[PDB]
């Protein structure tokens, strides 16, 4: 009775909160909470948002070097999901910070959650215009450091990923 | 609260048809897609609701029946026995009339348009079903594996096929199919046991040779060494009890059978091996995509249940692909029901149910509707 | 005073966009101005968020789209998809609100003047921008080179411009163009790779030949000298690896591609090359000032980043220029961004407050405000 | 005696080789340029004989040879097997030695100097030939249409070339190529016959599909109109008898094959079709010469023998080109050998005596003589 589970557009709203760089006084200092999760609903027919296991912005200036370092060991092993990231990278041609879609699909997650989050994968990706890079993760190690995101954006960015070299 | 809408799931696969309910993670019924009509010399009277025996029954009562194949190439051609096969599945093996239950079918890579439209017809007409879908084999396996780009090498009893996938869409002009299948492995496995003097020729012995196929077989690494090891050590020889207590033993033939997918020419085919067919289908895709296909080879189909096959494919693809590429073979746990486990979970999703491919959108949109919900 | 908006500097280019912030070292967004629409249709409703795929989102769409540039000359030929280029630059590529932050723009050499009034409209109506400014591109790279008089040869994306300038004033009687640049020479490199029996034909392969071109091509110090050197030295030719691990050798094509900009007749054109359009634009300037223009020949734009070109430019024009004259070809390191770096500084000079056109000056003085304040 | 004038002509074509004597009406042998390299010694020979088997011999030994096509892109990409094609053409198929007989060769469009030079070398240094000539086959087929100016579509089995010509000279700034040809039509034809369950996988079945190409296929005058007429009748369908005595019948698939020439997307190419590429080729020819090309579109080669193709091209190019121009498709009466037949006539004109490169015109300038004598 379906091709997959549907995207619920609040994922596009909280994506729009992260989508733009904006006015100084609060927006950049509060909205750019990188590593937010998009997850399957109660009835199992919608992809919705789940508040992720991350840090915000000013908190990067304290006891945690980056918000990816929060995320990469606060993911479920027995489930799949999508994550949204905002990856800062230097070359020496320019300094980018671009939006990335990540599909977390560890082999310890069951075939039915895999099949479900694979079904809707293209639909949420084709709704989020200005995602410039996308990848899928399968082990527990291919996820780990910030520089392990860099060849997935493309091997020209090897100079600095989130302030850390590849 | 959870929905009472349990759908029916039928994989047509290749050779072996497999069926059950959406929410079951394994089929409730599995049989060979074979049908047998009587001969008029020796015709039986008082059998079934139909003119032809199906599945195991058609092989359980031999000689008098003239057997016919409604599927070959993995593609449906007959419908006058395929619509018996589905009926005997629902009303005698699964124990229901399908009139309350949505019914999902599996499609083979490069299936003609109209076969989905005949699948819309027979469900709503012949079987009275409320809704349907048709989903292509290689996507169901790759989605259930938790990937989004790569190549599926699928290997069943009717055909073996190599299907490149990009985002979730199959690249059609890059697909390859090898003729060599679990059928020809059975043809060969009987004949090479007969070369050990263990003659097997009948329909009764064929299914014991199939039971041996599904138990004792594995792919060898570095063939001549495994041959020489079997020819000097009984470590690779393994025994089997036949139905009434008579014992046989099989060695070389346990891997010399599986080797026929890497060497089709050992049965006799002009065809290139599964690794060559994988290489040639990757090499028929675009310059910037080929990198991700070489690095994402998914094994599928019931003939990939053999140990050593992914372990061997790692040797065979690195003899063909550039050594700057880094070949990952993805061997999943389930392989026999690969497309049906993906199809079963897809069949439980009722996200769009009220304007779908339902029985009473048919009187408006006709059998054309099926292609308008195909991604 | 210290919590104000760092204005955007968005160069409209000639088929490649370049956009960053004022006081930042580099353009944030650099992408093709190409737009495409589908030649065949899908069935997946709601998955297309736009009618037209703009930029790198167009190059992405393998045989789906027919592609076109709205800005072939740097003069805009379609305004209504160029209206989407800037919208996609702000609300996708730069990731900023244009209603919050001011934008400095560029205009192409000798543009039909109503062009900049529709450019003032779209910023202040469709994107609702608070403040705007416009400059001619050749009057950016000359001041980045520390000149005010000189002759800027900009061989941009899509057309090569020659702009003689005296004390900032671009001499209108002396300007010209050669309709060929570093875009259209890329598809010329595909044809001379086809002479070797390599295939490159798709939009995916075009971007590899584009990459090959920018990394491995150079202008020959003389064509027949380097052809005679190529015939006597196999070390002239060199390797390139494709991203799937296939490898080819890119040969004398490394200079036969660039040479077509010194010899347009090789792609079938009537026009003389960049040396002679430089000579002819200098020889259309008044009696003495030849002197100061030959001594300040600035190369600008992406197609001037090749080795040997400064060397070669001097070589030809010293046979054409009256032999008392002593030519100086200027060839600085940042050639594609010299036409941006000086704009980043200009758009962050605190005293430039009165030179910016704010939203209110569009009323009383009309849309023509751009002809009062912007070069 | 005096009515015989002894010369040979070997057309290499767009990889479809055709050879006979100068004065033959149609060529004495015709075959695809392929060499089959064996995987064992003595497979068609005794020991101490030729290494590799050619064309006719190569397809005759299914499964047990590996093929190389040396003149793939119509230009010669390999000499070490092309040298064997020519040697076998003389000392096998034509049954005559070239040391005695002047041999005229053909060249394909866009061929480098070095290939023209190396082919001129081989004729004297590998084959001793008394005299030779290199003609461009498109102009021979234009002259066989009784023309000086026109636009030739050469379509063999290797590549399809769009060659615009003014008064015997091909205009090189406006020559185009569609790398899809009669090879890929033969490959695609096997797949759409396999959609109807017919066995068409092997080299043995493939060369029967090349006969189904000549015997059964046609271009539809409009595709979905012919599709709608076929999908509402039982009259378009045509039968074929297989060499074991089995019989088959092909419907809608008879026109799915060559529609690939108007829609390359049928084999996944984002390239333009034979209509679009010929139109683009005329449109890149300059001002008033286009009217003379529009009225003289010559169809050339084996892929122009299909019913409906000229009628279809006459539709497609009058839809593409502004109908104030008077568009005409034309062709030579015979056209599959016209490329060679114009060479037969040229090599037997007694006045061509001075235009033949006699072997001592190699002594004075080596293989460069072909730029002075072969117009």
GROMACS .gro file of C-alpha atoms in nm, chain B:
model
  375
  167UNK     CA    1  -0.313   0.104   1.791
  168UNK     CA    2  -0.171  -0.108   1.500
  169UNK     CA    3  -0.357  -0.178   1.167
  170UNK     CA    4  -0.531  -0.518   1.097
  171UNK     CA    5  -0.422  -0.479   0.725
  172UNK     CA    6  -0.187  -0.783   0.693
  173UNK     CA    7  -0.080  -0.800   0.323
  174UNK     CA    8   0.025  -1.117   0.129
  175UNK     CA    9   0.381  -1.132  -0.011
  176UNK     CA   10   0.476  -1.360  -0.306
  177UNK     CA   11   0.828  -1.371  -0.456
  178UNK     CA   12   0.836  -1.524  -0.808
  179UNK     CA   13   1.226  -1.510  -0.790
  180UNK     CA   14   1.381  -1.749  -1.041
  181UNK     CA   15   1.278  -2.121  -1.036
  182UNK     CA   16   1.154  -2.118  -0.672
  183UNK     CA   17   0.835  -1.922  -0.585
  184UNK     CA   18   0.819  -1.816  -0.214
  185UNK     CA   19   0.512  -1.683  -0.024
  186UNK     CA   20   0.380  -1.568   0.318
  187UNK     CA   21   0.228  -1.266   0.501
  188UNK     CA   22   0.368  -0.910   0.549
  189UNK     CA   23   0.510  -0.904   0.905
  190UNK     CA   24   0.659  -1.256   0.878
  191UNK     CA   25   1.038  -1.225   0.819
  192UNK     CA   26   1.054  -1.568   0.640
  193UNK     CA   27   0.812  -1.730   0.379
  194UNK     CA   28   0.540  -1.973   0.500
  195UNK     CA   29   0.555  -2.168   0.166
  196UNK     CA   30   0.841  -2.229  -0.085
  197UNK     CA   31   0.808  -2.458  -0.395
  198UNK     CA   32   0.951  -2.492  -0.755
  199UNK     CA   33   0.744  -2.302  -1.020
  200UNK     CA   34   0.667  -2.617  -1.228
  201UNK     CA   35   0.329  -2.743  -1.361
  202UNK     CA   36   0.232  -3.084  -1.513
  203UNK     CA   37  -0.071  -3.160  -1.739
  204UNK     CA   38  -0.176  -3.534  -1.782
  205UNK     CA   39  -0.113  -3.738  -2.099
  206UNK     CA   40  -0.440  -3.877  -2.250
  207UNK     CA   41  -0.279  -4.226  -2.254
  208UNK     CA   42  -0.295  -4.306  -1.878
  209UNK     CA   43  -0.504  -3.997  -1.776
  210UNK     CA   44  -0.608  -3.991  -1.405
  211UNK     CA   45  -0.964  -3.888  -1.302
  212UNK     CA   46  -1.057  -3.719  -0.970
  213UNK     CA   47  -0.773  -3.470  -0.901
  214UNK     CA   48  -0.778  -3.110  -0.768
  215UNK     CA   49  -0.987  -2.811  -0.882
  216UNK     CA   50  -0.772  -2.800  -1.204
  217UNK     CA   51  -0.632  -2.976  -1.515
  218UNK     CA   52  -0.264  -2.967  -1.401
  219UNK     CA   53  -0.064  -3.056  -1.084
  220UNK     CA   54   0.175  -2.785  -0.951
  221UNK     CA   55   0.501  -2.771  -0.749
  222UNK     CA   56   0.603  -3.081  -0.547
  223UNK     CA   57   0.285  -3.278  -0.655
  224UNK     CA   58   0.384  -3.267  -1.027
  225UNK     CA   59   0.723  -3.427  -0.940
  226UNK     CA   60   0.578  -3.666  -0.673
  227UNK     CA   61   0.369  -3.844  -0.948
  228UNK     CA   62   0.593  -3.869  -1.257
  229UNK     CA   63   0.580  -4.014  -1.614
  230UNK     CA   64   0.202  -3.980  -1.678
  231UNK     CA   65   0.232  -3.596  -1.657
  232UNK     CA   66   0.393  -3.379  -1.927
  233UNK     CA   67   0.578  -3.108  -1.723
  234UNK     CA   68   0.584  -2.742  -1.848
  235UNK     CA   69   0.776  -2.435  -1.720
  236UNK     CA   70   0.560  -2.112  -1.689
  237UNK     CA   71   0.871  -1.901  -1.602
  238UNK     CA   72   1.219  -1.914  -1.750
  239UNK     CA   73   1.486  -1.633  -1.774
  240UNK     CA   74   1.335  -1.522  -1.437
  241UNK     CA   75   1.046  -1.368  -1.644
  242UNK     CA   76   0.678  -1.479  -1.658
  243UNK     CA   77   0.552  -1.587  -2.006
  244UNK     CA   78   0.259  -1.821  -1.918
  245UNK     CA   79  -0.034  -1.691  -1.709
  246UNK     CA   80  -0.286  -1.985  -1.754
  247UNK     CA   81  -0.074  -2.189  -1.502
  248UNK     CA   82   0.078  -1.891  -1.310
  249UNK     CA   83  -0.285  -1.802  -1.210
  250UNK     CA   84  -0.315  -2.170  -1.086
  251UNK     CA   85   0.021  -2.142  -0.894
  252UNK     CA   86  -0.098  -1.827  -0.705
  253UNK     CA   87  -0.441  -1.991  -0.633
  254UNK     CA   88  -0.286  -2.315  -0.492
  255UNK     CA   89  -0.047  -2.092  -0.287
  256UNK     CA   90  -0.332  -1.882  -0.129
  257UNK     CA   91  -0.617  -2.135  -0.097
  258UNK     CA   92  -0.422  -2.462  -0.016
  259UNK     CA   93  -0.067  -2.378   0.115
  260UNK     CA   94  -0.128  -2.038   0.296
  261UNK     CA   95  -0.494  -2.132   0.385
  262UNK     CA   96  -0.683  -1.809   0.287
  263UNK     CA   97  -0.877  -1.637   0.007
  264UNK     CA   98  -0.672  -1.314  -0.072
  265UNK     CA   99  -0.986  -1.090  -0.091
  266UNK     CA  100  -0.916  -0.898   0.237
  267UNK     CA  101  -0.531  -0.885   0.198
  268UNK     CA  102  -0.324  -0.650  -0.034
  269UNK     CA  103  -0.085  -0.866  -0.248
  270UNK     CA  104   0.281  -0.770  -0.334
  271UNK     CA  105   0.471  -0.941  -0.623
  272UNK     CA  106   0.847  -0.920  -0.711
  273UNK     CA  107   0.962  -0.804  -1.064
  274UNK     CA  108   1.276  -0.937  -1.243
  275UNK     CA  109   1.535  -0.681  -1.387
  276UNK     CA  110   1.428  -0.596  -1.751
  277UNK     CA  111   1.068  -0.731  -1.719
  278UNK     CA  112   0.841  -0.612  -2.015
  279UNK     CA  113   0.590  -0.326  -1.932
  280UNK     CA  114   0.266  -0.528  -1.977
  281UNK     CA  115   0.360  -0.797  -1.718
  282UNK     CA  116   0.295  -0.540  -1.438
  283UNK     CA  117  -0.039  -0.455  -1.609
  284UNK     CA  118  -0.133  -0.831  -1.620
  285UNK     CA  119  -0.034  -0.841  -1.246
  286UNK     CA  120  -0.290  -0.557  -1.190
  287UNK     CA  121  -0.560  -0.749  -1.394
  288UNK     CA  122  -0.538  -1.093  -1.222
  289UNK     CA  123  -0.524  -0.950  -0.866
  290UNK     CA  124  -0.840  -0.737  -0.906
  291UNK     CA  125  -1.023  -0.974  -1.151
  292UNK     CA  126  -0.918  -1.347  -1.102
  293UNK     CA  127  -0.833  -1.319  -0.725
  294UNK     CA  128  -1.064  -1.029  -0.606
  295UNK     CA  129  -0.770  -0.862  -0.412
  296UNK     CA  130  -0.824  -0.503  -0.271
  297UNK     CA  131  -0.476  -0.355  -0.365
  298UNK     CA  132  -0.132  -0.447  -0.511
  299UNK     CA  133   0.225  -0.343  -0.592
  300UNK     CA  134   0.519  -0.479  -0.795
  301UNK     CA  135   0.881  -0.404  -0.684
  302UNK     CA  136   1.204  -0.498  -0.869
  303UNK     CA  137   1.420  -0.773  -0.704
  304UNK     CA  138   1.766  -0.600  -0.684
  305UNK     CA  139   1.631  -0.283  -0.508
  306UNK     CA  140   1.446  -0.490  -0.238
  307UNK     CA  141   1.773  -0.675  -0.154
  308UNK     CA  142   1.993  -0.354  -0.159
  309UNK     CA  143   1.745  -0.154   0.058
  310UNK     CA  144   1.715  -0.449   0.308
  311UNK     CA  145   2.101  -0.454   0.315
  312UNK     CA  146   2.106  -0.078   0.415
  313UNK     CA  147   2.292   0.070   0.111
  314UNK     CA  148   2.196   0.332  -0.155
  315UNK     CA  149   2.450   0.289  -0.446
  316UNK     CA  150   2.647  -0.019  -0.563
  317UNK     CA  151   2.596  -0.338  -0.768
  318UNK     CA  152   2.383  -0.640  -0.671
  319UNK     CA  153   2.502  -0.981  -0.799
  320UNK     CA  154   2.190  -1.199  -0.755
  321UNK     CA  155   2.205  -1.581  -0.819
  322UNK     CA  156   1.893  -1.808  -0.806
  323UNK     CA  157   1.783  -2.140  -0.963
  324UNK     CA  158   1.652  -1.982  -1.291
  325UNK     CA  159   1.906  -1.698  -1.359
  326UNK     CA  160   2.202  -1.499  -1.221
  327UNK     CA  161   2.201  -1.115  -1.280
  328UNK     CA  162   2.431  -0.817  -1.211
  329UNK     CA  163   2.233  -0.495  -1.147
  330UNK     CA  164   2.415  -0.157  -1.084
  331UNK     CA  165   2.206   0.077  -0.855
  332UNK     CA  166   2.245   0.461  -0.834
  333UNK     CA  167   2.059   0.643  -0.544
  334UNK     CA  168   1.804   0.351  -0.553
  335UNK     CA  169   1.729   0.354  -0.932
  336UNK     CA  170   1.883   0.069  -1.141
  337UNK     CA  171   2.097   0.180  -1.442
  338UNK     CA  172   1.916  -0.027  -1.714
  339UNK     CA  173   2.170  -0.020  -2.004
  340UNK     CA  174   2.444  -0.143  -1.761
  341UNK     CA  175   2.256  -0.460  -1.641
  342UNK     CA  176   2.394  -0.806  -1.730
  343UNK     CA  177   2.234  -1.150  -1.686
  344UNK     CA  178   2.431  -1.476  -1.689
  345UNK     CA  179   2.233  -1.784  -1.807
  346UNK     CA  180   2.418  -2.009  -1.551
  347UNK     CA  181   2.189  -2.083  -1.251
  348UNK     CA  182   2.102  -2.325  -0.966
  349UNK     CA  183   1.917  -2.534  -1.237
  350UNK     CA  184   2.244  -2.599  -1.428
  351UNK     CA  185   2.431  -2.656  -1.099
  352UNK     CA  186   2.172  -2.937  -1.033
  353UNK     CA  187   2.218  -3.075  -1.397
  354UNK     CA  188   2.595  -3.074  -1.336
  355UNK     CA  189   2.585  -3.194  -0.963
  356UNK     CA  190   2.387  -3.510  -1.065
  357UNK     CA  191   2.629  -3.583  -1.355
  358UNK     CA  192   2.954  -3.540  -1.150
  359UNK     CA  193   2.815  -3.767  -0.870
  360UNK     CA  194   2.746  -4.013  -1.158
  361UNK     CA  195   3.122  -3.971  -1.253
  362UNK     CA  196   3.199  -4.094  -0.892
  363UNK     CA  197   2.967  -4.392  -0.984
  364UNK     CA  198   2.678  -4.263  -0.764
  365UNK     CA  199   2.427  -4.259  -1.054
  366UNK     CA  200   2.137  -4.012  -1.002
  367UNK     CA  201   1.889  -3.961  -1.292
  368UNK     CA  202   1.526  -3.968  -1.162
  369UNK     CA  203   1.295  -3.691  -1.028
  370UNK     CA  204   1.321  -3.858  -0.681
  371UNK     CA  205   1.707  -3.848  -0.680
  372UNK     CA  206   1.719  -3.490  -0.828
  373UNK     CA  207   1.560  -3.343  -0.510
  374UNK     CA  208   1.808  -3.536  -0.285
  375UNK     CA  209   2.090  -3.389  -0.505
  376UNK     CA  210   1.914  -3.049  -0.446
  377UNK     CA  211   1.906  -3.126  -0.064
  378UNK     CA  212   2.284  -3.206  -0.090
  379UNK     CA  213   2.330  -2.876  -0.292
  380UNK     CA  214   2.154  -2.680  -0.011
  381UNK     CA  215   2.375  -2.851   0.261
  382UNK     CA  216   2.725  -2.971   0.171
  383UNK     CA  217   2.842  -2.727  -0.103
  384UNK     CA  218   3.080  -2.424  -0.080
  385UNK     CA  219   3.298  -2.218  -0.321
  386UNK     CA  220   3.668  -2.320  -0.324
  387UNK     CA  221   3.946  -2.060  -0.313
  388UNK     CA  222   4.227  -2.115  -0.567
  389UNK     CA  223   4.058  -2.422  -0.723
  390UNK     CA  224   4.352  -2.654  -0.816
  391UNK     CA  225   4.482  -2.649  -0.452
  392UNK     CA  226   4.135  -2.749  -0.314
  393UNK     CA  227   4.117  -3.021  -0.589
  394UNK     CA  228   4.470  -3.147  -0.493
  395UNK     CA  229   4.380  -3.129  -0.117
  396UNK     CA  230   4.064  -3.345  -0.184
  397UNK     CA  231   4.273  -3.586  -0.402
  398UNK     CA  232   4.524  -3.638  -0.111
  399UNK     CA  233   4.315  -3.581   0.208
  400UNK     CA  234   3.967  -3.717   0.301
  401UNK     CA  235   3.933  -3.390   0.508
  402UNK     CA  236   3.723  -3.240   0.219
  403UNK     CA  237   3.513  -3.562   0.165
  404UNK     CA  238   3.171  -3.562   0.348
  405UNK     CA  239   2.906  -3.840   0.381
  406UNK     CA  240   2.523  -3.840   0.331
  407UNK     CA  241   2.249  -4.104   0.411
  408UNK     CA  242   2.001  -4.151   0.119
  409UNK     CA  243   1.622  -4.186   0.214
  410UNK     CA  244   1.628  -4.563   0.308
  411UNK     CA  245   1.968  -4.589   0.485
  412UNK     CA  246   2.208  -4.631   0.189
  413UNK     CA  247   2.523  -4.411   0.234
  414UNK     CA  248   2.718  -4.198  -0.021
  415UNK     CA  249   3.025  -3.965   0.009
  416UNK     CA  250   3.100  -3.637  -0.184
  417UNK     CA  251   3.426  -3.430  -0.195
  418UNK     CA  252   3.546  -3.237  -0.509
  419UNK     CA  253   3.185  -3.224  -0.638
  420UNK     CA  254   3.088  -3.006  -0.331
  421UNK     CA  255   3.295  -2.715  -0.479
  422UNK     CA  256   3.336  -2.824  -0.847
  423UNK     CA  257   2.955  -2.763  -0.865
  424UNK     CA  258   2.967  -2.400  -0.709
  425UNK     CA  259   3.275  -2.327  -0.935
  426UNK     CA  260   3.042  -2.336  -1.244
  427UNK     CA  261   2.938  -1.971  -1.171
  428UNK     CA  262   3.310  -1.869  -1.205
  429UNK     CA  263   3.362  -2.118  -1.498
  430UNK     CA  264   3.026  -2.164  -1.697
  431UNK     CA  265   3.245  -2.345  -1.959
  432UNK     CA  266   3.286  -2.637  -1.705
  433UNK     CA  267   2.917  -2.716  -1.782
  434UNK     CA  268   2.982  -2.597  -2.144
  435UNK     CA  269   2.852  -2.235  -2.187
  436UNK     CA  270   3.026  -1.962  -2.399
  437UNK     CA  271   2.938  -1.725  -2.107
  438UNK     CA  272   3.192  -1.547  -1.883
  439UNK     CA  273   3.199  -1.601  -1.501
  440UNK     CA  274   3.010  -1.404  -1.227
  441UNK     CA  275   3.326  -1.193  -1.152
  442UNK     CA  276   3.374  -1.116  -1.526
  443UNK     CA  277   2.997  -1.038  -1.556
  444UNK     CA  278   3.031  -0.810  -1.243
  445UNK     CA  279   3.340  -0.642  -1.403
  446UNK     CA  280   3.171  -0.596  -1.749
  447UNK     CA  281   2.849  -0.452  -1.593
  448UNK     CA  282   3.053  -0.203  -1.375
  449UNK     CA  283   3.262  -0.115  -1.689
  450UNK     CA  284   2.932  -0.032  -1.873
  451UNK     CA  285   2.853   0.249  -1.618
  452UNK     CA  286   2.968   0.618  -1.612
  453UNK     CA  287   3.329   0.728  -1.530
  454UNK     CA  288   3.251   0.898  -1.190
  455UNK     CA  289   3.003   0.629  -1.065
  456UNK     CA  290   3.225   0.314  -1.133
  457UNK     CA  291   3.442   0.387  -0.822
  458UNK     CA  292   3.139   0.341  -0.587
  459UNK     CA  293   3.017   0.023  -0.770
  460UNK     CA  294   3.363  -0.152  -0.743
  461UNK     CA  295   3.352  -0.059  -0.372
  462UNK     CA  296   2.986  -0.186  -0.314
  463UNK     CA  297   2.932  -0.541  -0.455
  464UNK     CA  298   2.621  -0.686  -0.279
  465UNK     CA  299   2.579  -1.068  -0.297
  466UNK     CA  300   2.213  -1.184  -0.328
  467UNK     CA  301   2.014  -1.497  -0.425
  468UNK     CA  302   2.001  -1.847  -0.272
  469UNK     CA  303   2.306  -1.982  -0.461
  470UNK     CA  304   2.528  -1.723  -0.272
  471UNK     CA  305   2.458  -1.921   0.056
  472UNK     CA  306   2.780  -2.120  -0.025
  473UNK     CA  307   3.079  -2.040   0.211
  474UNK     CA  308   3.393  -1.895   0.042
  475UNK     CA  309   3.201  -1.704  -0.234
  476UNK     CA  310   3.266  -1.344  -0.108
  477UNK     CA  311   3.616  -1.449   0.004
  478UNK     CA  312   3.672  -1.581  -0.355
  479UNK     CA  313   3.501  -1.276  -0.524
  480UNK     CA  314   3.764  -1.061  -0.339
  481UNK     CA  315   4.040  -1.252  -0.534
  482UNK     CA  316   3.853  -1.265  -0.869
  483UNK     CA  317   3.754  -0.893  -0.888
  484UNK     CA  318   4.111  -0.778  -0.785
  485UNK     CA  319   4.240  -0.976  -1.091
  486UNK     CA  320   4.012  -0.760  -1.319
  487UNK     CA  321   3.963  -0.421  -1.145
  488UNK     CA  322   4.249  -0.159  -1.105
  489UNK     CA  323   4.458  -0.222  -0.785
  490UNK     CA  324   4.410   0.150  -0.692
  491UNK     CA  325   4.039   0.053  -0.629
  492UNK     CA  326   3.953  -0.104  -0.292
  493UNK     CA  327   3.699  -0.382  -0.351
  494UNK     CA  328   3.444  -0.440  -0.069
  495UNK     CA  329   3.213  -0.741  -0.111
  496UNK     CA  330   2.895  -0.705   0.101
  497UNK     CA  331   2.767  -1.057   0.190
  498UNK     CA  332   2.430  -1.022   0.384
  499UNK     CA  333   2.304  -1.285   0.641
  500UNK     CA  334   1.978  -1.374   0.454
  501UNK     CA  335   2.030  -1.453   0.080
  502UNK     CA  336   1.759  -1.713  -0.016
  503UNK     CA  337   1.459  -1.490   0.064
  504UNK     CA  338   1.667  -1.167  -0.008
  505UNK     CA  339   1.401  -0.992  -0.221
  506UNK     CA  340   1.102  -1.135  -0.019
  507UNK     CA  341   1.233  -0.998   0.321
  508UNK     CA  342   1.254  -0.651   0.154
  509UNK     CA  343   0.912  -0.707  -0.014
  510UNK     CA  344   0.745  -0.827   0.313
  511UNK     CA  345   0.841  -0.507   0.502
  512UNK     CA  346   0.748  -0.290   0.194
  513UNK     CA  347   0.406  -0.471   0.183
  514UNK     CA  348   0.337  -0.369   0.550
  515UNK     CA  349   0.371   0.007   0.469
  516UNK     CA  350   0.020   0.158   0.429
  517UNK     CA  351   0.140   0.524   0.396
  518UNK     CA  352  -0.053   0.610   0.072
  519UNK     CA  353  -0.332   0.341   0.086
  520UNK     CA  354  -0.637   0.561   0.001
  521UNK     CA  355  -0.510   0.656  -0.351
  522UNK     CA  356  -0.267   0.374  -0.435
  523UNK     CA  357  -0.322   0.088  -0.683
  524UNK     CA  358  -0.651  -0.023  -0.518
  525UNK     CA  359  -0.914  -0.254  -0.683
  526UNK     CA  360  -1.162   0.035  -0.740
  527UNK     CA  361  -0.924   0.290  -0.890
  528UNK     CA  362  -0.925   0.027  -1.176
  529UNK     CA  363  -1.276   0.115  -1.316
  530UNK     CA  364  -1.140   0.472  -1.374
  531UNK     CA  365  -0.764   0.438  -1.454
  532UNK     CA  366  -0.755   0.076  -1.594
  533UNK     CA  367  -0.442  -0.153  -1.570
  534UNK     CA  368  -0.215   0.146  -1.666
  535UNK     CA  369  -0.222   0.277  -1.301
  536UNK     CA  370   0.065   0.046  -1.182
  537UNK     CA  371   0.335   0.247  -1.371
  538UNK     CA  372   0.217   0.580  -1.213
  539UNK     CA  373   0.322   0.468  -0.858
  540UNK     CA  374   0.651   0.304  -0.981
  541UNK     CA  375   0.951   0.525  -0.871
   0.00000   0.00000   0.00000
